[PDB]
Amino acid sequence: GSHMVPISFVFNRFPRMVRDLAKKMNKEVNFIMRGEDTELDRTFVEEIGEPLLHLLRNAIDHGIEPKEERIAKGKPPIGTLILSARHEGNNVVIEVEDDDVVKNVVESLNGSISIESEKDKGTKVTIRLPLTLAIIQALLVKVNNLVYAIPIANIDTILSISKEDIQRVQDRDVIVIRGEVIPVYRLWEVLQIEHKEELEEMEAVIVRVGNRKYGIVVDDLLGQDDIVIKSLGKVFSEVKEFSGAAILGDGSIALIINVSGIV
Amino acid sequence: SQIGETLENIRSIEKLIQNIMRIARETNILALNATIEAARAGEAGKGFMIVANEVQNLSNETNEVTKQIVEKAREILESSQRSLE
């Protein structure tokens, strides 16, 4: 829903703001923005534009030396910094360059302005703000009327096993499938919910993690769908057993099971 | 009285039930035209439009039953006045 718009609303505040920062330091420094229509996410109108002002204030003063120390170093009598902005996969890369409270100003809404450099070439700056807002194939599951989405790309297969196959071991339960052993887990348990008990043949979903994969047994299986994952505040930053909830269609809220976030 | 009282009543209920029948129409817009147009002022447009909605929903319910009065009340005479017959 138009959640995407040209960067003209959070990047054009430089062709005249970087000018004054060059006069208050007696150091001539060019400034040509290579592109200013980077359709980064709209919600960045206050966490990327401004933060890009602390990466340029060092592109003039703390970088290029006056003619007296310039034409006698290794840089031409005139330098040229370039303030760019593009998309590399799913991350807007509105970089900055030339020739710790701000370490959070951009890291608030994704980002982490750093400082890389060398000798007689200048310092380079680059932030990281995702510009991909929209599609996530997920597996919608239910547990006593609790819709929990499972990141599709993480799933490997959905097999229905009977409460027979299970063969407890050193502790965690397991099931022998294709010669391999999967540590089966009961979703409602790792989430601590008042479950009924255990139906006869329960449906389990095999999720892949790192180099292994465990099985996740659930109550009922709704149906895969493209949801709108959204960070559910910080009041949950502790609950590592998740990633972010989302509002389905009919209006029902559904949390996403961060696969790696479960014993 | 009675066979006449009924009339002295139905009419006494009509001119009144019609009054409610009136409001149902005034509210049907005095609020509907305030929501479908509330999306003009501050961002609270989406917040006010809904609160204004319900106003009608649980309001119409009046007529739903209120009109159910005449519907039967009119039978009173329809039968009592007919009892004259």
Binding site: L191, G233, A245 | -
Partner: protein, 139 residues
């Protein structure tokens, strides 16, 4: 100097904060439970299209409580954080000033939470501080 606060009680216990950090008020509804969350949280609700967490305010000040009387959800708004507070009945506006204030932050429990305590001709209207109160729920 004229403060506008939201008046409401929590079992014979009055509280109130400046509307500056208020969005609206709704009635306790389908509060989707958040697993392994934090004892003082109810869960999250769908409002206007976003998922706002419903905290149990009364459960923060270690005061009275009643899942039943808790029928009013107060949605707040910090610098960029949005949180709803499940509480009891609500009153409304209330003109505050340096006259109604009777600072005595040396006669109770939880401190920083409340900026002070006001009095209306002899009431129990306690002035809360959403900012510092929310700052505890966060970080």
């Amino acid at each position: 100097k004229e403060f506008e606060v939201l008046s409401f009680e929590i079992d014979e216990q009055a509280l109130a904060f400046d509307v500056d950090n208020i969005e609206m008020v709704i009635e306790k509804s389908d509060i989707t439970p958040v697993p392994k969350s934090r004892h003082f949280v109810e869960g999250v609700i769908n409002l206007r299209g976003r998922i706002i967490p419903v905290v149990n305010l009364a459960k923060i000040l270690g005061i009275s409580f009643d899942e039943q009387k808790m029928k009013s959800i107060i949605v707040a708004r910090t610098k960029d954080v949005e949180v709803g507070f499940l509480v009891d009945r609500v009153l409304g506006v209330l003109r505050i000033t340096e006259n109604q204030l009777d600072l005595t932050n040396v006669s109770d429990k939880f401190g920083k939470k409340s900026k002070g305590l006001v009095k209306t001709d002899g009431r129990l209207i306690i002035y809360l501080d959403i900012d510092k109160i929310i700052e505890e729920i966060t970080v």
